[PDB]
């Protein structure tokens, strides 16, 4: 790893992206009904996003807390965890963020080609039911943030350590979806799926 801060512009790009991706994941994995969703133009393309103000504020609050951590390159993973009725995870959408040595050599340029680069992640999420089985009815979600070895930003939006039950998933299928290697970060999106559910 290198140690370079992403800076504000990159942090804000990633948070705006993560917001869209969460909405899209909730839609395609049917965590919430299609009825609370209306299309919005994001990255020059119609993406389904929730019109439910409280769900929206929750996703927004979550990412507002992640943003300063991103700015300082202190985030290793942001994970959208889908939990069944027994609060056991059935699916994880992992956004793994790294900055390997020599990253920037022959890399893409996120800021210059935002829509181009991120739209591919949108496409992959939107068709990922091709490589997953249907989830059980009654699933919920949460967001887990893995911090680097070396967040309570908002009034009345506290964070706590996740429990083992949030994280334990036996025998997971791994499906890589998309990787982006840009000037100052690498982001890999992949899904972990519970074997039988």
């Amino acid at each position: 790893r290198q140690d370079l801060n992403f800076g504000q512009v990159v942090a804000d790009v990633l948070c705006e992206f993560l917001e869209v991706a969460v909405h899209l994941i909730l839609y395609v994995r049917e965590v919430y009904p299609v009825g609370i969703f209306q299309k919005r133009k994001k990255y020059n393309v119609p993406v389904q996003m929730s019109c439910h103000p409280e769900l929206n504020q929750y996703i927004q609050d979550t990412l507002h807390c992640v943003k300063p951590l991103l700015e300082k390159n202190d985030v290793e993973k942001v994970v959208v965890v889908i939990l069944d009725k027994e609060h056991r995870p059935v699916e994880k959408f992992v956004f793994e963020i790294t900055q390997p040595p020599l990253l920037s050599i022959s890399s893409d340029s996120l800021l210059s080609h935002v829509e181009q680069l991120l739209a591919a992640f949108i496409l992959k999420i939107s068709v990922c039911d091709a490589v997953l089985d249907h989830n059980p009815p009654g699933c919920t979600f949460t967001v887990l943030v893995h911090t680097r070895e070396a967040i309570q930003v908002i009034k009345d939006f506290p964070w706590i350590l996740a429990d083992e039950q949030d994280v334990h998933m036996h025998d997971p299928r791994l499906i890589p979806l998309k990787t982006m290697t840009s000037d100052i970060l690498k982001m890999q999106l992949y899904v972990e799926e519970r074997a039988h559910k």
Partner: peptide, 13 residues
Amino acid sequence: SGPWKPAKPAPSV
């Protein structure tokens, strides 16, 4: 290193 999660639950609809 966490992982950390929001204490509040995701809203039900």
